[model samples]
Target chain A: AQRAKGPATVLAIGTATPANVVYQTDYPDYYFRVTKSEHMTKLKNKFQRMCDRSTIKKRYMVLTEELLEKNLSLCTYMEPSLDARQDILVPEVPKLGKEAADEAIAEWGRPKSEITHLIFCTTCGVDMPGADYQLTKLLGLRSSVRRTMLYQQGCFGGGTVLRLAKDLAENNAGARVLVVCSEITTAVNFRGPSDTHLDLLVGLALFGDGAAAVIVGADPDPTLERPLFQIVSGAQTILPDSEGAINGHLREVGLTIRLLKDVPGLVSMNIEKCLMEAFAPMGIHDWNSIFWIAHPGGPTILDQVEAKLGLKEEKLKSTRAVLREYGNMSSACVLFILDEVRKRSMEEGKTTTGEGFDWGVLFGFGPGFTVETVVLHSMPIP
Target chain B: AAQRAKGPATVLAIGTATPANVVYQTDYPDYYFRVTKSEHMTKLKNKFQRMCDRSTIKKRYMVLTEELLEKNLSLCTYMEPSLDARQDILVPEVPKLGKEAADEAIAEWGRPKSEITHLIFCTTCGVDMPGADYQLTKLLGLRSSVRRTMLYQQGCFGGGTVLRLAKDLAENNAGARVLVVCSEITTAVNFRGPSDTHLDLLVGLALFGDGAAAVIVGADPDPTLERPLFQIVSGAQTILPDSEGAINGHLREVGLTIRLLKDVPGLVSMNIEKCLMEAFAPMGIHDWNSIFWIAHPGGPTILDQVEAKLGLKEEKLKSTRAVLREYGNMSSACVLFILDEVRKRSMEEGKTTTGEGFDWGVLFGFGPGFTVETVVLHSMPIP
Candidate 1:
């Protein structure tokens, strides 16, 4: 599995969101109607305050309005059980996953059969024969294509998939690797008026369901005018003594989300140091020289990254737009920002590496208090 | 990551471990009959007796013991409830077993934990976020910078995937040393429910055992040792389009369970030669005599089909059969056990490379997707 090349180039990227969309302004009213009258009166103010301050305009969910209304109108207003949620999630995830992957592959202008590797990343759902294997069958990919499924890596999983694709593409010359990241946060969104579970409202208010896919290879096709980024380096580290800062665990209901109050501070304080270490060997000395692509974990997390990394607001424009258009999609969020970046580059006619601003770096953080960073350049050759 | 050199990686050492508890094949009937109470008990007993007698397995290991069962008979009495039963058994025991194997491998290779740059852990039974990877990080004192990958739900062929990835890391990252650990807890998901009527399930029950195996791989060999064990040269993989349904791993309520069809041997025998030709013909491996064979012993018949299809002599598969007889099928860990036996035999017979010691061998395993992963190992002396 050793490649003759140094780094893989990103050829094309695409993303998809679920059909159901809800505005942040409408979330609280929906919440009030869904909860019991006594509980709603007690928690409605706090919930509306949180939603108003979330800085999220709209987000997608896997649940249809009819289904949501039907459930809420019940005598007891029963929330979907874990089994019911998973039944929809198990098949819906891969369908959205495959759609994004199909678009990326088509844009890359290659037959599906030519893809040598397929990697699927998700943390929201677990299946026996995994979504990765099923996606291959659905996409008409070759049966011999190598497959890898990364489970429970958290939001950093998007960064993880690209890091892996870089390794696979660079180690094997002419290797066409397709990477997909899909998450069904809406399926596992369990909220209640009780203070014990109220802490989850932050995630439930911000997280959405989405999928993103990318096509990576050793070289970009010369005949096609496409925007590409060369992978320079990839590095990651799990913070010491900070394991519980951001945690998700499976219970009978679903995966419970836990976010400590100090998480943004934890990330802001250590991320700069982590990035410095990751970029040191590449001879990168100034933060201003590289374009920043931060994972929009939330609006405040982006603010923390902007201040800590000493970057102007312009560096996070794409990231903020992604979050504004679609709430945090877990592993699929960073790729959405990347896809936006590529679209902007194409609009400006930066068709190849080194044609314009050449240096960029992507940063993602998640559970294990883990930080993942990847350095990219617009160099035509290694 | 870029490397200063593009040399083949050397396998430094291997270590294996099984749980403390052992169950003899002869006692399986009494164990099965004791748990099941149905009007069809007589027929079930006879069928299970025949299975135990024909399994060719003398004994196997498990994390669950007879003592614990004696005290709490309901602990593992039902199939569905055993999912909860196995969760308790897996989390505490799998890490312990894997750590033991890793410690032995590190000691044998004369390397400290800090030298390991990558850790790849494989398991099909456990389902937790901070799983074996996190456990090894805590127990082995691996650095926070060490890259960790947990390969889950890959079934028996998971070991081949890890070996391929290890080779990539060793060759592409200078000074990288990878430690690969494959572990399985078969008894935790042992299903013998009355509703199960498939011959394949019975075969699965009689075939699997619990074990863990570890290997240390690097681009360089130990200065104190005469030679390394195996040099990973190249690897190839193929998945049959129509064979996906022949074998699969399912995530049931209890845990990860395997569903294997009885026609697996027939499908494999009919299609294996063509697949091998597609994978190896370009590598100059034309016939069975060209390389030492190390195949996963899924079952006796699967081994038989492979031998007959490839026109290989019985001696070529002795190590595979020996492992099956001794440990049953330990899923992904079984192939490593077979590789260990092959290396020990070569060392015993003083058969090694002139510079290429024990060169030119093939390692293969089958899993869900009807996937066949093959690694071609060639030994070359330290340069």
Candidate 2:
């Protein structure tokens, strides 16, 4: 993998998370969805002792068909509230998404012609003329948006797209890049806790339908504002031959998102081993100096990350806040969290870089049970 | 550009074309769907053909569908929905198109993956995650040694991916099997009514269907199958300033299709004429007979514009017109489809290029806007 020099500059960042996040305490839906088969009583009694979801605010939720399809007359699907029908496209994901992305581009005043690449991320359902292509023409993206679609790297796949965009941007200069991460977890909503449950649903209760777009370039473009995070390094650790560990398979009548129940704990055990290995080459020994834009898998996972990394509780507050509000937006969740931290920096007029690390630790995971980790540095260190 | 040390050994041979089999004629539903006020012919007369008749695919293959294209879903849902995922494979407007492509490849050399150095598939519609990913892995029997995976929306940009792949393969070794897939259902879908008018739909409907794969590799040393149609001569273009407004695709949750501009051909002519003159004239000959024109069949007008710019006769563009009539604009594959029709003349009856004097083929594609993707191909030396 290191045979050639990797892209050195950071580029555009765009993200989207579902609407209507819910926490475990607010409703039985959280725990119920996580464990499709297990009872609420049994689930709470077993996991509540070790993992308390109340502290972590996990934000990122899938929207209902009625909400998304109400204004957009073009879409149609099997259910008013989508669940388990991958066969039906729920119909509204792209319509709203296209509108959202077009709005983002318009707000930014970025011309459609400049985009050289289109990176799309989704782990929900199945449809051709998928979001990337549908949005390409819908948004009237340049015919030359040399598109490469990456799917189902699972949740971390959003981070994975950012990494990919960064890689490509490094090679192709002034690469006007766009990455769209949208999820319709409602379709594959786990009705009750079976094995897919993550205790952090308590933190994920506030997610509202949202999408974020950021412009990144090898050389900063005059048209766009400076990026909050300068992409410094990216690495993917595929646990050798680790298939079936966390499977997202269509089971019985519908698609199933199985977390193996033990993955977070498993990932927690290996977080240091993985992160250290990933960061070793960069000589990043001082974790305290960096900003934690960590992808909060769930409340418990964040707590575990803090415990494992030996970071202060405040290090992940921003990330924790996003999770608390929006469950896992899956692919697009990390971008939302990163963008929030970015928004804070911009608001306070904080410069891109500073004396110490000022690093952003971004991470995600999916069915491969694969972990994608990215560490980005600010450009104009304040 | 051929490699400095050694050009890639992959040569193209017997490229063929196929259209999705069904052709759904536009009747009441479409007319009703587009024009809210109009009921009769006079009200709806001059508008461009919008969506390809959902059924008007001249040739279609079943395996490429969301239900079947996706990997785990079919296997996971097997117990509950035991029906073969293939049955659920609808003829997507921009249909899932791999069966015909696979069959076409099989008919060709049918070389094992071990022999293949790379597999490059370019399509605007109908793709699965492990799509070209698994296609190269399992479907084509490509070797693990051959480990480059690419799933791109080259749209009309696919032609660029084809040539790009050739460039990439040439970088590594001489004879790498870089199979290019350009499946476009332009006819099936991608006709935004307001955006396109004046038989724009028919230009697409008449010509494009989800078919055309050009299995090219680095310039091969082998003399048997056929030498490259031509070494990819130099290509150049300048994006028209406002051209971006012409062609664009937005990712919608439903499916991807483009909003193309009607004035694209004019864009191609203005910027490309000079570049074409420079590239072709340098090859010598004021009136180049060796030039083979494998242009993308954008539409009747676009093709006509290109032809007029190059001073080509209508008959000179017979292959292009034929492809346009039969398949529409198969995105990047349009040029390849034209190339496919042309090879028949040479290989079958040893026909000379462009009838008698032409040997070099100038290929061009217009997409997104009026931006032109151009290439120079020549008659392959055969037995």
All DockQ scores: 0.45, 0.08
Query: What digit string (tens of lDDT, one per residue) describes model 2 on residues B191-220?
Result: 323322333433343344456565555554
In model 2, the Cα lDDT at residue A75 comes to: 24
- The docking category that best describes candidate 2 is incorrect
Residue-level lDDT tens digits of model 2 in A227-301: 446676555554534444555433223333444346667677766766676568677766776777766666667
By TM-score, the best candidate is 1
TM-score of each: 0.92, 0.58
Model 1: residues >4 Å from true position, as ranges? A35-38, A65-82, A191-193, A224-227, A259-261, A346-356, A379-382, B1-4, B35-40, B67-82, B196-200, B220-227, B353-358, B380-383
User: Who wins the lDDT comparison?
Assistant: 1
lDDT of 1 by residue, B115-148 (tens): 8888888887666655567777778888888777
What fraction of the true interface does each of the listed models get right, in terms of native contacts kept?
A: 0.34, 0.05
Tens digits of lDDT, candidate 1, A298-357? 788779778877787777878888888897898889888887777666566664333245
